[PDB]
Protein backbone atom coordinates (compact mmCIF):
# COMPACT_ATOMS: atom_id res chain seq x y z
CA UNK A 1 0.00 0.00 0.00
CA UNK A 2 0.95 3.67 0.10
CA UNK A 3 2.96 5.55 2.72
CA UNK A 4 1.79 4.95 6.31
CA UNK A 5 2.60 7.46 9.07
CA UNK A 6 0.92 6.17 12.25
CA UNK A 7 0.80 9.61 13.88
CA UNK A 8 -2.65 9.11 15.41
CA UNK A 9 -4.06 6.34 17.60
CA UNK A 10 -6.13 3.67 15.85
CA UNK A 11 -9.64 4.63 16.93
CA UNK A 12 -11.61 2.45 14.53
CA UNK A 13 -11.77 -0.69 16.66
CA UNK A 14 -15.27 -2.23 16.96
CA UNK A 15 -15.75 -0.30 20.21
CA UNK A 16 -14.51 3.13 21.28
CA UNK A 17 -14.12 1.74 24.78
CA UNK A 18 -15.43 2.18 28.30
CA UNK A 19 -16.07 5.49 30.03
CA UNK A 20 -16.21 4.79 33.74
CA UNK A 21 -17.70 7.65 35.74
CA UNK A 22 -17.23 7.59 39.52
CA UNK A 23 -19.61 10.18 40.96
CA UNK A 24 -19.05 10.73 44.67
CA UNK A 25 -21.63 13.16 46.04
CA UNK A 26 -22.42 11.95 49.57
CA UNK A 27 -19.66 11.12 52.03
CA UNK A 28 -19.71 9.23 55.31
CA UNK A 29 -20.32 11.57 58.25
CA UNK A 30 -17.24 10.04 59.88
CA UNK A 31 -14.97 11.57 57.22
CA UNK A 32 -16.09 15.15 57.76
CA UNK A 33 -16.38 15.59 53.99
CA UNK A 34 -19.16 17.84 52.68
CA UNK A 35 -21.74 16.78 50.11
CA UNK A 36 -20.74 17.78 46.58
CA UNK A 37 -23.85 19.59 45.38
CA UNK A 38 -23.94 19.90 41.62
CA UNK A 39 -21.87 16.81 40.86
CA UNK A 40 -24.95 15.03 39.50
CA UNK A 41 -25.17 17.69 36.80
CA UNK A 42 -21.55 16.89 35.89
CA UNK A 43 -22.18 13.14 35.90
CA UNK A 44 -25.23 13.47 33.65
CA UNK A 45 -23.45 15.86 31.27
CA UNK A 46 -20.53 13.43 30.98
CA UNK A 47 -22.76 10.44 30.34
CA UNK A 48 -24.49 12.25 27.46
CA UNK A 49 -21.27 13.71 26.06
CA UNK A 50 -19.41 10.41 25.96
CA UNK A 51 -22.53 8.54 24.82
CA UNK A 52 -22.48 10.62 21.65
CA UNK A 53 -18.79 9.81 21.16
CA UNK A 54 -19.92 6.18 21.21
CA UNK A 55 -18.33 5.15 24.51
CA UNK A 56 -19.82 2.45 26.73
CA UNK A 57 -20.63 4.67 29.71
CA UNK A 58 -20.88 3.06 33.14
CA UNK A 59 -21.72 5.21 36.13
CA UNK A 60 -21.13 4.49 39.81
CA UNK A 61 -22.33 6.72 42.63
CA UNK A 62 -20.94 7.17 46.13
CA UNK A 63 -18.23 4.51 46.16
CA UNK A 64 -16.07 3.75 49.19
CA UNK A 65 -12.29 3.68 48.77
CA UNK A 66 -12.47 -0.13 48.67
CA UNK A 67 -15.21 -0.10 46.02
CA UNK A 68 -13.22 2.30 43.85
CA UNK A 69 -10.20 0.00 43.95
CA UNK A 70 -12.32 -3.09 43.30
CA UNK A 71 -14.07 -1.41 40.37
CA UNK A 72 -10.78 -0.35 38.77
CA UNK A 73 -9.22 -3.77 39.28
CA UNK A 74 -12.26 -5.52 37.78
CA UNK A 75 -12.38 -3.14 34.83
CA UNK A 76 -8.65 -3.50 34.15
CA UNK A 77 -9.16 -7.27 34.10
CA UNK A 78 -11.72 -7.15 31.29
CA UNK A 79 -10.70 -7.99 27.73
CA UNK A 80 -10.32 -4.60 26.02
CA UNK A 81 -9.02 -6.20 22.79
CA UNK A 82 -11.87 -4.81 20.67
CA UNK A 83 -11.84 -1.39 22.34
CA UNK A 84 -9.92 1.61 20.99
CA UNK A 85 -9.38 3.38 24.30
CA UNK A 86 -10.28 3.66 27.97
CA UNK A 87 -11.76 6.62 29.84
CA UNK A 88 -12.24 7.09 33.57
CA UNK A 89 -13.78 10.19 35.11
CA UNK A 90 -13.35 10.89 38.82
CA UNK A 91 -15.68 13.37 40.53
CA UNK A 92 -14.95 13.83 44.24
CA UNK A 93 -13.04 15.59 47.00
CA UNK A 94 -9.28 15.37 46.69
CA UNK A 95 -5.80 16.66 47.40
CA UNK A 96 -2.58 16.42 45.40
CA UNK A 97 -2.36 12.88 44.00
CA UNK A 98 -5.42 11.76 45.94
CA UNK A 99 -9.11 11.17 45.23
CA UNK A 100 -11.63 10.53 48.00
CA UNK A 101 -13.82 7.49 48.40
CA UNK A 102 -16.92 8.04 50.54
CA UNK A 103 -15.03 6.65 53.55
CA UNK A 104 -11.49 7.84 52.89
CA UNK A 105 -8.76 8.75 50.37
CA UNK A 106 -7.37 6.66 47.52
CA UNK A 107 -4.01 7.31 45.86
CA UNK A 108 -4.55 8.15 42.20
CA UNK A 109 -1.45 6.09 41.45
CA UNK A 110 -3.13 2.97 42.84
CA UNK A 111 -6.07 3.50 40.48
CA UNK A 112 -3.97 4.17 37.38
CA UNK A 113 -1.45 1.40 38.08
CA UNK A 114 -4.09 -1.19 37.17
CA UNK A 115 -3.91 0.13 33.62
CA UNK A 116 -0.12 0.21 33.25
CA UNK A 117 1.11 -1.10 29.91
CA UNK A 118 2.37 -4.27 31.57
CA UNK A 119 -0.67 -4.93 33.77
CA UNK A 120 -3.53 -4.45 31.28
CA UNK A 121 -2.22 -5.98 28.06
CA UNK A 122 -5.43 -5.42 26.08
CA UNK A 123 -4.93 -1.68 26.51
CA UNK A 124 -1.19 -1.64 25.79
CA UNK A 125 -0.53 0.95 23.08
CA UNK A 126 -4.02 2.43 23.48
CA UNK A 127 -4.87 5.80 25.03
CA UNK A 128 -5.92 5.66 28.68
CA UNK A 129 -7.63 8.89 29.74
CA UNK A 130 -8.23 9.94 33.33
CA UNK A 131 -10.38 13.04 33.80
CA UNK A 132 -10.17 14.38 37.33
CA UNK A 133 -12.53 16.90 38.92
CA UNK A 134 -11.18 17.27 42.46
CA UNK A 135 -8.94 19.59 44.45
CA UNK A 136 -5.17 19.23 44.23
CA UNK A 137 -4.45 21.35 47.28
CA UNK A 138 -5.64 24.51 48.99
CA UNK A 139 -4.09 27.32 46.95
CA UNK A 140 -6.31 29.98 45.40
CA UNK A 141 -5.55 31.86 42.17
CA UNK A 142 -6.14 35.61 42.62
CA UNK A 143 -6.04 36.11 38.87
CA UNK A 144 -4.89 39.16 36.93
CA UNK A 145 -6.81 41.80 34.98
CA UNK A 146 -6.22 41.55 31.22
CA UNK B 1 26.09 6.25 14.79
CA UNK B 2 25.76 3.58 17.48
CA UNK B 3 25.18 3.51 21.22
CA UNK B 4 24.21 1.39 24.21
CA UNK B 5 20.70 2.78 24.67
CA UNK B 6 19.03 2.79 21.25
CA UNK B 7 17.60 0.47 18.59
CA UNK B 8 16.88 -2.51 20.87
CA UNK B 9 16.30 -5.88 19.21
CA UNK B 10 13.09 -6.37 21.20
CA UNK B 11 10.75 -3.36 21.05
CA UNK B 12 9.37 -2.11 24.36
CA UNK B 13 7.44 0.94 25.52
CA UNK B 14 7.25 2.52 28.99
CA UNK B 15 4.54 1.09 31.24
CA UNK B 16 3.59 4.71 31.95
CA UNK B 17 3.21 5.57 28.27
CA UNK B 18 -0.15 6.31 26.64
CA UNK B 19 -1.79 7.89 29.68
CA UNK B 20 -3.49 11.29 29.62
CA UNK B 21 -4.57 13.04 32.82
CA UNK B 22 -7.01 15.90 32.30
CA UNK B 23 -6.88 17.68 35.66
CA UNK B 24 -9.51 20.30 36.46
CA UNK B 25 -6.97 22.54 38.16
CA UNK B 26 -3.26 23.36 38.51
CA UNK B 27 -1.07 21.38 40.94
CA UNK B 28 -1.64 22.44 44.55
CA UNK B 29 -4.83 24.40 43.83
CA UNK B 30 -8.46 24.14 44.86
CA UNK B 31 -10.93 23.25 42.10
CA UNK B 32 -14.23 25.12 41.78
CA UNK B 33 -17.74 23.70 41.54
CA UNK B 34 -21.04 25.54 41.17
CA UNK B 35 -23.56 23.83 43.46
CA UNK B 36 -26.19 24.46 40.79
CA UNK B 37 -24.51 24.24 37.38
CA UNK B 38 -21.74 21.76 38.17
CA UNK B 39 -17.96 22.17 38.13
CA UNK B 40 -16.38 24.78 35.87
CA UNK B 41 -14.09 22.13 34.40
CA UNK B 42 -16.63 19.43 33.60
CA UNK B 43 -19.14 22.02 32.31
CA UNK B 44 -16.48 23.32 29.93
CA UNK B 45 -15.03 19.93 28.97
CA UNK B 46 -18.43 18.65 27.89
CA UNK B 47 -19.21 21.85 25.98
CA UNK B 48 -15.93 21.68 24.06
CA UNK B 49 -16.24 17.96 23.33
CA UNK B 50 -19.79 18.46 22.06
CA UNK B 51 -18.63 21.22 19.74
CA UNK B 52 -15.19 19.99 18.63
CA UNK B 53 -14.91 16.20 19.08
CA UNK B 54 -15.64 15.72 15.37
CA UNK B 55 -13.28 18.52 14.35
CA UNK B 56 -10.15 18.72 16.54
CA UNK B 57 -7.37 16.58 17.97
CA UNK B 58 -7.87 15.92 21.70
CA UNK B 59 -5.04 18.13 22.97
CA UNK B 60 -6.48 21.05 21.00
CA UNK B 61 -9.93 20.40 22.48
CA UNK B 62 -8.46 20.38 25.99
CA UNK B 63 -6.65 23.63 25.20
CA UNK B 64 -10.02 25.23 24.35
CA UNK B 65 -11.27 23.90 27.70
CA UNK B 66 -8.31 25.59 29.42
CA UNK B 67 -9.20 28.89 27.76
CA UNK B 68 -12.91 28.60 28.56
CA UNK B 69 -12.34 27.90 32.26
CA UNK B 70 -9.59 30.51 32.53
CA UNK B 71 -11.54 33.34 30.91
CA UNK B 72 -15.23 32.74 31.61
CA UNK B 73 -15.21 31.76 35.27
CA UNK B 74 -14.56 33.62 38.52
CA UNK B 75 -15.71 32.58 41.99
CA UNK B 76 -18.29 34.43 44.04
CA UNK B 77 -18.15 34.00 47.81
CA UNK B 78 -19.45 35.81 50.88
CA UNK B 79 -16.08 34.87 52.38
CA UNK B 80 -13.50 37.37 51.11
CA UNK B 81 -10.82 34.67 51.23
CA UNK B 82 -12.57 32.59 48.56
CA UNK B 83 -14.03 35.44 46.51
CA UNK B 84 -13.07 36.52 42.97
CA UNK B 85 -10.78 33.56 42.38
CA UNK B 86 -9.72 31.99 39.10
CA UNK B 87 -8.86 28.53 37.81
CA UNK B 88 -6.73 26.99 35.09
CA UNK B 89 -7.11 23.28 34.20
CA UNK B 90 -3.98 21.19 33.81
CA UNK B 91 -3.37 18.87 30.84
CA UNK B 92 -0.85 16.14 31.63
CA UNK B 93 0.03 14.05 28.60
CA UNK B 94 2.14 10.92 28.37
CA UNK B 95 0.43 10.08 25.07
CA UNK B 96 2.60 8.99 22.13
CA UNK B 97 0.22 9.82 19.27
CA UNK B 98 -2.47 12.29 18.31
CA UNK B 99 -5.98 11.35 19.38
CA UNK B 100 -9.11 11.94 17.30
CA UNK B 101 -12.45 10.59 18.53
CA UNK B 102 -13.57 10.17 14.93
CA UNK B 103 -12.08 8.35 11.94
CA UNK C 1 -28.97 31.66 31.83
CA UNK C 2 -27.28 33.59 34.63
CA UNK C 3 -25.04 32.77 37.57
CA UNK C 4 -22.67 34.14 40.20
CA UNK C 5 -19.43 32.90 38.64
CA UNK C 6 -19.53 33.84 34.95
CA UNK C 7 -19.34 36.83 32.61
CA UNK C 8 -17.48 39.18 34.95
CA UNK C 9 -17.52 42.89 34.10
CA UNK C 10 -13.73 43.07 34.44
CA UNK C 11 -11.91 40.34 32.50
CA UNK C 12 -9.24 38.40 34.38
CA UNK C 13 -7.18 35.28 33.73
CA UNK C 14 -5.52 32.90 36.21
CA UNK C 15 -2.00 33.90 37.24
CA UNK C 16 -1.05 30.28 36.52
CA UNK C 17 -2.46 30.38 32.98
CA UNK C 18 -0.27 30.28 29.87
CA UNK C 19 2.48 28.09 31.32
CA UNK C 20 3.74 24.92 29.65
CA UNK C 21 6.06 22.51 31.45
CA UNK C 22 7.82 20.02 29.18
CA UNK C 23 9.14 17.46 31.66
CA UNK C 24 11.67 14.89 30.49
CA UNK C 25 10.06 12.15 32.56
CA UNK C 26 6.89 11.04 34.35
CA UNK C 27 6.19 12.22 37.92
CA UNK C 28 8.28 10.34 40.47
CA UNK C 29 10.66 8.82 37.92
CA UNK C 30 14.37 9.04 37.19
CA UNK C 31 15.34 10.73 33.92
CA UNK C 32 18.01 9.20 31.66
CA UNK C 33 21.09 10.86 30.20
CA UNK C 34 23.74 9.36 27.91
CA UNK C 35 27.12 10.61 29.13
CA UNK C 36 28.19 10.82 25.49
CA UNK C 37 25.14 11.78 23.41
CA UNK C 38 23.21 13.80 25.96
CA UNK C 39 19.82 13.19 27.57
CA UNK C 40 17.22 11.13 25.72
CA UNK C 41 14.67 13.91 26.17
CA UNK C 42 16.72 16.87 24.99
CA UNK C 43 18.19 14.84 22.10
CA UNK C 44 14.66 14.02 20.97
CA UNK C 45 13.15 17.44 21.65
CA UNK C 46 15.74 19.15 19.48
CA UNK C 47 15.36 16.57 16.71
CA UNK C 48 11.59 17.01 16.62
CA UNK C 49 11.75 20.81 16.77
CA UNK C 50 14.28 20.86 13.94
CA UNK C 51 12.02 18.69 11.81
CA UNK C 52 8.54 19.95 12.75
CA UNK C 53 8.72 23.48 14.19
CA UNK C 54 7.70 24.91 10.81
CA UNK C 55 4.97 22.31 10.34
CA UNK C 56 3.19 21.38 13.59
CA UNK C 57 1.51 22.93 16.62
CA UNK C 58 3.71 22.67 19.73
CA UNK C 59 1.66 20.05 21.57
CA UNK C 60 1.84 17.81 18.50
CA UNK C 61 5.62 18.27 18.34
CA UNK C 62 5.93 17.33 22.02
CA UNK C 63 3.76 14.28 21.37
CA UNK C 64 6.26 13.15 18.71
CA UNK C 65 8.99 13.68 21.31
CA UNK C 66 7.05 11.45 23.72
CA UNK C 67 6.87 8.71 21.08
CA UNK C 68 10.55 9.03 20.13
CA UNK C 69 11.79 8.75 23.72
CA UNK C 70 9.31 5.99 24.57
CA UNK C 71 10.12 3.78 21.59
CA UNK C 72 13.75 4.41 20.64
CA UNK C 73 15.48 4.45 24.02
CA UNK C 74 16.28 1.81 26.63
CA UNK C 75 18.95 2.03 29.32
CA UNK C 76 22.07 -0.11 29.43
CA UNK C 77 23.71 -0.64 32.81
CA UNK C 78 26.15 -3.06 34.38
CA UNK C 79 23.91 -2.73 37.45
CA UNK C 80 20.89 -5.00 36.93
CA UNK C 81 18.74 -2.58 38.93
CA UNK C 82 19.18 0.20 36.36
CA UNK C 83 19.37 -1.96 33.24
CA UNK C 84 16.83 -2.19 30.39
CA UNK C 85 14.71 0.68 31.68
CA UNK C 86 12.36 2.95 29.75
CA UNK C 87 11.21 6.56 29.91
CA UNK C 88 8.17 8.59 28.94
CA UNK C 89 8.33 12.42 28.92
CA UNK C 90 5.50 14.35 30.55
CA UNK C 91 3.74 17.29 28.87
CA UNK C 92 2.03 19.58 31.37
CA UNK C 93 -0.01 22.29 29.71
CA UNK C 94 -1.79 25.25 31.26
CA UNK C 95 -1.74 26.98 27.86
CA UNK C 96 -4.94 28.63 26.62
CA UNK C 97 -4.20 28.68 22.89
CA UNK C 98 -2.41 26.69 20.22
CA UNK C 99 1.25 27.55 19.75
CA UNK C 100 3.03 27.68 16.40
CA UNK C 101 6.63 28.89 16.24
CA UNK C 102 6.00 30.26 12.76
CA UNK C 103 3.42 32.67 11.34
Amino acid sequence: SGISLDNSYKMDYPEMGLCIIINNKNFHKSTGMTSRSGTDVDAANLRETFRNLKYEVRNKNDLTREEIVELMRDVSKEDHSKRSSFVCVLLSHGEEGIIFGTNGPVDLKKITNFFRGDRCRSLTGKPKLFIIQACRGTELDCGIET
Amino acid sequence: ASGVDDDMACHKIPVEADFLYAYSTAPGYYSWRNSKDGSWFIQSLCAMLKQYADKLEFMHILTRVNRKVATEFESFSFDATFHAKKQIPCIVSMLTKELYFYH
Amino acid sequence: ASGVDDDMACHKIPVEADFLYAYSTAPGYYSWRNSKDGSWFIQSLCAMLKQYADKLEFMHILTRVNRKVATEFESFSFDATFHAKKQIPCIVSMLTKELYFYH
Partner: peptide
Protein backbone atom coordinates in the same frame (compact mmCIF):
# COMPACT_ATOMS: atom_id res chain seq x y z
CA UNK D 1 -19.42 28.21 44.42
CA UNK D 2 -17.77 25.54 46.57
CA UNK D 3 -14.38 23.79 46.54
CA UNK D 4 -13.57 20.18 46.02
Amino acid sequence: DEVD
